[PDB]
């Protein structure tokens, strides 16, 4: 099963405004470029986000952790039992990616995700924020986590949790309209309550949001008006029901695409009981 | 097997009664009705008690909680295995309990017993309690425990652990007479020493008493208090022998179902030692 | 000023019913005799409660410890410049009660005081309980504490506070009567919330109870239970209002003496802010 | 596998003086009499100890616990499996034990065992010890340990780690001559370092002492001062080099059987890696 | 699987230099001979580095441990079941090296390994350092690393790993020229980071360098300086990129073989993620 | 007034004994000499033993330390006030015992006395103990203790206390005949519950003891041993009824002077209470 997420790679139309949002408001550290795109770090890994020019303006592919070559072995058997296509990833892309191997495929919709393992990490040249940010949290945990739209959330949930080992954590039913919700299906792979969600939003993104963790309550609160500063708020600070995570929500400069900033969940493991939310919030998070 | 004991339901013929007692005097949180039964909360859950009118005067149902849809189906493989009937919670008593799956079965004397999973939550409305009473210790350990009378402790045994999966934590030979007593048996399925004690009593209840575990001592002595008031206490406080909770016991409004208001006992895991005692009480629990 | 409650001396009229009390039911260590009074330990003290034959049954002495002798001399100074006449105690005392030095006086309403340093100690024959009880708080603390009966407060009061150096904790209005309440002012000189309190009950004794502090509250539940046993028992278990001892009272084999066995309190500093509370228990402390 | 060692019962010549040694010296509580036999208690269990009149002055039996009845079924299992001869115990000496089921056997060289679960405890009646002593270390970890005597080790391995599931610790080489050692065996079956320990001495008993672990360092300090007045001393203060227990060795009342007084040792789990040490003590134990 | 690295034995040109260097520059306790080897403690163990005189001037042999005699048996199958030749260590063999048994075979490369359980302890002669160390960091985790040159590390690590037991931790493309580089791969069998290290450098010996662990940094410090003193200094201070070590190297007495001294790594477990690193050195390690 | 004992000087009639006693068993580092005095180390002080030849085979001073210039000065004017004769230490002096600055003088029965500032600390030679000890307990509380021998009490007591500055923890009636006794004061000048003790003791020397304090309880076992193999021990393994230290006793090479070797005692402050006791040792210390 899949360890944790890594890394995520962006294609969009504004290439220096994906780098300022990345850089003076979220805080990550610029790190170069391989090929043509710009990469960007939150730890001691070579890059963690990695931002593309392209008319998508969208999640261009997700990096799916494992943690040794055998494990990306099994995860390849568990591909061909399952019938799902991949292939393994040349010695560019693994180049290109800073890895010692990877298996590229896409999930039903056709996001492109790519499982990998063995990557750089460059501790000679040490995390660097580019705006006021203690850190980030990652390690075991990964980068962070990612709501998935999918149009059919019984299919997407059979893939990444039978054919990826992703489990369950919850459901919160969204409300959308005044008689119209959408139940979005939390998954776990570590002990992060949420790295990727599912849900069927009628929006013309592969994702909504992504979302990083910083290490404290400051970090958030200062990030807040660093992006509210840059006109990109769009939820004010809240707390989630189901992780706890004390976040708000900005736009990135891609449309329809925002991301999450966030401090303080809860986290999981082999005891989480499954339950089912009518609210997204315990507290705050209203939308402007 | 079984995770947690997660809800109660009383049938009594006296609504207001039982209304005023659970809050003003337990400090449950009133959480407003589902079709013709008033539910009370204790924590994040949208309920924990709920008390339909009846001639009963009794418990009418225990629900009983597994972490996923899969262990459910797990447990209907176990009781189809057992040949005990059941049968599947249609979408009107999904509805009505507020859960994602049930399975409806009785015990071997006739307790109705739901096997559930993903119960609501709703920390956007939290836990206000009627009296003052600080919170209760419910998580993984669930609502409390309760005290089930049977003719047969041998196969209401069989039936609890081979079929249900609760284990022997201890017995407590209970003094009855002057020369009778009656061996409690003290089931575990979780951290808590004991979710479901089973004992031969002659009383015309299909339980002797439900208990709820409390924050602090402080909230046991202002619960006494309470109660004592209302002039229902019928024990002095006391401490347990086998799971050393403080507690004492109080009358409900329906006749020889008692409530017990604990707090502070040991827990216990896989390498508790089944042992024998010959009190109910360390010290304490004078009856009155 | 005084530093602490040292030990007391009781002349009754049962001593071997005082010495089963002590012993068999509140737990202390017989420690043989000096002269015509038998002696009781709760620690590595020698002694802390005498028992003698007497008509009284009531208190005899109470002893009142300083550091060494220089504060010995340094209270002789403070009472002669309040006019206190005091002697100072003789060989045959200083033998009689194990101390270096002593000096004794009566406070304004006939109650023997003994000032002193240096009492004896004797590691070398460790505390043995005569009942199951894990030990008592005392240390800096002292013994415990007593409440004073006087027919003046004020009066008693300013000999407390201004001679003696005792600080006022604070006040309590004891509810006597339908109409009635005594203000009972309770006194620190340590880190203890009160070692003398001062009422003015009608109670033809010198004091209402003397109170000893155990270690644990099973320490505390276990006494409740051999008082009872005893037939002694005058107060169900409750926790004070002031200092949030949680005990129970009950009776000594002198008529209207008591005993307080407890467990648990705040302590108080330089800090401590003088309050008044309506009642005695925050709950519990019933009488019976 | 057994899960630790429960009572021990001697048969024993002088009972007034066991019975003295036991209480007055080591500081068990005296808890009445089962048939003939004095029992003495360590903690909530009903007894620990048995001393019965005999001609042998030596270890009658040991009892060997395990947590439940089905563990006790497994370990009827594998006795039939290895062939070793045992019966069921009787209702009379399930009555005589306080236990709940019990196997009767012996090992390789007539040591009786009984291997038994459910023993009686007795919390309303709390330990009370007889001589200083602040309690003992027992729960998990059982009573203490003993060392058996064999004229054949392998022999005696076999049968305590194939049949039992002791696991061996480390051994040590004993110096009892000039040019003469005996290797013992150190068996845990817990987190004690051992339980059980084999050794091949030319004494003509079974056993060539038991000990007993007290809470504190002050605990062996005073008994050792105890056991010297009543000349029973035979080792002085010291640490061992395998499980680094701070303790002294004394006679017990029948000739050639030592007891142990100590304290403060590691404790093992699975990673606990087998040493051979030449010595018995890191320091001290010089033997009186 | 072998469970941590236990002893080194070196054979040398210069044993008088040998010995100054590990006990008046390193720090370790002289602690006689065995044979023609002379010996040296780190810690409670009899040995943990030998020196005997011959040309090689190089690693002799390297102990890797396991915790009992079942396990070796184990290793044994291991290796007739992987067709690597193996002889059982004689009772000469057994008694020189202090050990209970071992299996004597080399590494594809010729390095001889000798396999083992049951080293002598001894407590009774306390670890005394001959120069101001506080103590090394051994323990579960075994006496330190050691780095094994190799001709083919593919087939190295198919060894190591597949027969062996040990595990991959990470890879570091250590930088030889100004484009070349060798992929030093490190692994452990333990929570240390790595216990072997295996590079293709192209240097004459077995081993590029031995690593010792100690408790401080001030150790580490203090140390630095005595080998300076040496002139044997080959790195300034640094902390490694993979494991967190802060340590410095120096010259042994035999050429082109170093020591490593340090302090203060991360451990590891079964979580520990495959990674690939650019540099040896977070910081420092400037070649001297 | 003093802040703690810093040092200790003997003359003595066998250097060479002194040497070995103090390095081999006890474990102070040899370092070197001042004009003809051997010096030893305890810690990073450059000296804190003294040991020089001479007939007394006794204490030949005591370094007293304060912790600046201007605090020396004070204790100049105290001596001048009091009438205690003195003269300041010549550069001579100041370079032998590397101060400062010094005031030389005498107690009232001939003991020289050294009252200093600005020791010489000398971190870059680290401590390396002599023989295994992890370290000696000094710091603020100064190297240790020694027991002066007195032929007045009261007026030993006047000097070191109105003085000297020194504090009187508490007496202790030390047994020497069957009906005779010694009042032994102790008395503190920092936390060390002692650090000078007075007694009139029959014995022909200036001091009793000198008492080191060790890290742990190992250190005196060890110690305990390695004095035993010199056939010096005077006592066995005890604890002190007043301060709680953990130690035994043992002879110098000087007749009638021993050294006490200990751990673990309680330390004391503005709070302590002045008690007295009847027995040294709360628990062993049997003289041998
Ligand atoms: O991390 C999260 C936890 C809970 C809910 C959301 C969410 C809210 C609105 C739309 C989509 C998801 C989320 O991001
Ligand atoms: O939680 C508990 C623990 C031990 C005994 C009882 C009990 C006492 C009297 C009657 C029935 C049960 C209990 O409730
Ligand atoms: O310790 C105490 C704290 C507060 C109240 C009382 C008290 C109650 C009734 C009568 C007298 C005193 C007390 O004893
Ligand atoms: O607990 C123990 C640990 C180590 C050695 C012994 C021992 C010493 C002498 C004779 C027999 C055993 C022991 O009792
Ligand atoms: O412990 C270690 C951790 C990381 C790198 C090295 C290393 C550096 C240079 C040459 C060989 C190995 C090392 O020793
Ligand atoms: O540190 C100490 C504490 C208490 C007593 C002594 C003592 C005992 C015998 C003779 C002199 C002193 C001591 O040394
Ligand atoms: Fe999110
Ligand atoms: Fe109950
Ligand atoms: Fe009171
Ligand atoms: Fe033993
Ligand atoms: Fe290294
Ligand atoms: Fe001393």
Redesign the interface.
Known sequence: SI?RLGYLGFAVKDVPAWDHFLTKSVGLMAAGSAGDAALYRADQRAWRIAVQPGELDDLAYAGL?V???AALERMADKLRQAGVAFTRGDEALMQQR?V?GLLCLQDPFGLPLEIY????????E?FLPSAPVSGFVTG?QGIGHFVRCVPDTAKAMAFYTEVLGFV?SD?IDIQMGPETSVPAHFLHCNGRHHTIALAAFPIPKRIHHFMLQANTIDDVGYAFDRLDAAGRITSLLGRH?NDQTLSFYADTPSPMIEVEFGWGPRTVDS?????????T???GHKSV
């Open positions: 360890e952790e943690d040794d070559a800073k010692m393992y063995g990557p750089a990490e460059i501790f000679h040490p075991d369950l459901i029901t005891s989480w009981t499954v339950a089912r939310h009518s609210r919030a315990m507290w």
